[PDB]
From a paper:
Similar to its free form, HBb successfully crystallized in complex with a randomized 20 bp DNA fragment (20 bp-GC50) within a few days, yielding the two distinct crystal forms HBb-DNA_1 and HBb-DNA_2. These could be processed to a resolution of 1.95 Å (HBb-DNA_1) and 1.85 Å (HBb-DNA_2), and solved by molecular replacement using the free form of HBb as a search model. Additionally, clear electron density for short DNA fragments was apparent in both structures, albeit in different positions. For HBb-DNA_1, the asymmetric unit contains a 5 bp dsDNA fragment, which forms an infinite dsDNA helix throughout the crystal via crystallographic symmetry. Both monomers of the HBb dimer interact with the minor groove of this DNA. Specifically, residues K12 in helix α1, T23 and S24 in loop l1, and A25 in helix α2 of one monomer, as well as K52 and T53 in loop l2 and R57 in helix α3 of the other monomer, form an interaction network with the phosphate groups of the DNA backbone through their side chains and backbones. The superposition of the HBb-DNA_1 and HBb-DNA_2 structures illustrates the location of the combined HBb-DNA binding interfaces, resembling histone-DNA complexes found in eukaryotes and archaea. The engagement of these interfaces suggests that the DNA undergoes bending upon binding with the HBb dimers. For the starting structure, we combined the HBb-DNA_1 and HBb-DNA_2 crystal structures to create a complete DNA molecule bent around the HBb dimer.
Residue numbers in the entry:
A (entry chain B): 1 to 62
B (entry chain A): 3 to 63
The structure:
DNA sequence: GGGCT
DNA sequence: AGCCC
């Protein structure tokens, strides 16, 4: 799907290796929505600063 | 290390923002995913489950 | 590599 | 001049 923004295999490997847990399909969808929201907040910060580039300091996790 | 699909993130930010994406931006997004997944493991384990589910990924903040 | 922010 | 397409 063109909608998936996370590397499914690497996310499942992290959760398996660090948690001994499986990962639901819906977990991948929520993580992809999280990325989309972070990128859109990033665009707003960069635009407010009059920049053309989304930089690390534009991505704030509360 | 990289947990986001770099080409799709750059396409989203280019298409939705008419902006470039810094290399460090990709690293911060990957750190964000790692932290969300590890908080997910905590919630799932606390609930006695063997699967990280959507309700384990808390993002409303 | 070839420009750009 | 460091860094992005």
């Amino acid at each position: 799907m063109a909608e998936v923004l996370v590397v499914t295999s690497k996310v499942k490997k992290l959760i398996k290796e660090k948690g001994q847990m499986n990962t639901s399909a819906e977990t991948i969808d929520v993580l992809s929505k999280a990325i989309e929201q972070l990128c859109l907040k990033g665009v707003e910060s960069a635009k407010a600063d009059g920049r053309k580039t989304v930089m690390a300091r534009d991505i704030v996790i509360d």
